[PDB]
Amino acid sequence: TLDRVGVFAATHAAVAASDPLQARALVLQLPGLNRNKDVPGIVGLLREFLPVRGLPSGWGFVEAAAAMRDIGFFLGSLKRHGHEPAEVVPGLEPVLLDLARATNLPPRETLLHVTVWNPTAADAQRSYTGLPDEAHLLESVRISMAALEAAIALTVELFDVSLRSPEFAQRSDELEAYLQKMVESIVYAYRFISPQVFYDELRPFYEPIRVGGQSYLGPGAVEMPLFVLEHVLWGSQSDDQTYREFKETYLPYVLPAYRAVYARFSGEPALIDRALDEARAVGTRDEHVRAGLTALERVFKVLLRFRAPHLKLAERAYEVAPSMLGELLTLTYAARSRVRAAL
Ligand code: HEM
Ligand SMILES: N[C@@H](Cc1c[nH]c2ccccc12)C(=O)O
């Protein structure tokens, strides 16, 4: 029934099916080498497939992203053992910059590379550690990524829909159904991911690396374009400094299309600012205004049903959390409160 997911899942599967460096059997050997902390071996394994003579001219986005994925697991691994990958692998940096050029993404692996663009089968899935907890971590993102992309499209569409129209309530109800997948992700994480194993065994693989004379953050679900959705939905005109910096920090890591969505809405009132201004002008005696606001409140409810438990999970891992999480939750409650007050 979440019919819009299909196309996004299909585009992900295209990258996941691609192995342009014929590296599948090679990357599967990485977990054992990480367990052994075998740095020379990690470099040697990478050199078995790293292009030395530039990128094949026939490659498009799909091949370049797939290549970045397979090289990428080596980047996080080398840094995990205390080494700048660019410093220990000659000729690596130019390849990373070429792949960045070909994908219009940063010159290292991102969330997309390690989750939705990473095949799912046991004989193919790339991993830093080979641990069950890592496999569960990747699955938690696959549960909701395509749904989130659909949700972004639905939010952009809703922005131009009048609150006076019955379409507003209907589109909002639809948006809520897609955002429920984020809740499913966190439920999944609670059930299957050890916060201790995350903190002690997985987290070390996601440190920043230096390429091209700047630092690039490691993969994380923090890179999910949920912040772009909410930029459009409520946050575009926020004067909260910490929040603004958070969005600008992760902007480079999302797909080009979402970076442009973000740019489009930055110089404008957010959806709810427009929605509430309309409600105050027309009045809540209009049934479609009442229904629209009610449906919009339910959208905030589902964001909070993701965000509140997520914070507890993050705090539990650190018990074995960064301040921006609690700050973002507070902003989200305030956003919902504005809708509640309008009614
Ligand atoms: C034990 C598992 C998890 C831990 C320990 C964790 C931890 C964190 C931390 C510490 C942050 C703040 C950013 C940072 O400093 O890295 C964060 C942000 C974020 N996380 Fe998680 N996380 C977990 C699971 C998940 C899952 C399953 C999802 C969704 C699939 C998710 C989605 C997000 C998003 C979208 C952000 C950006 C901030 C926000 O929207 O509130 N996380 N996470
Ligand atoms: N949200 C956390 C933990 C997390 C969830 N899914 C992930 C996938 C890859 C790396 C980290 C994660 C983070 O961004 O760090």
UniProtKB/Swiss-Prot annotation:
Disruption phenotype: Cells lacking this gene lose the ability to produce pyrrolnitrin.
Residues annotated to bind substrate: 219-222, 318
Pathway(s) served: Antibiotic biosynthesis
Record keywords, A-Z: Antibiotic biosynthesis, Heme, Iron, Metal-binding, Oxidoreductase
InterPro entries on file: PrnB (IPR015029), Trp/Indoleamine_2_3_dOase-like (IPR037217)
Documented EC number(s): 1.14.19.-
Ligand binding (heme): 310
UniProt-listed Pfam families: PrnB
Family statement: Belongs to the PrnB family.
Name this polypeptide is given: Monodechloroaminopyrrolnitrin synthase PrnB
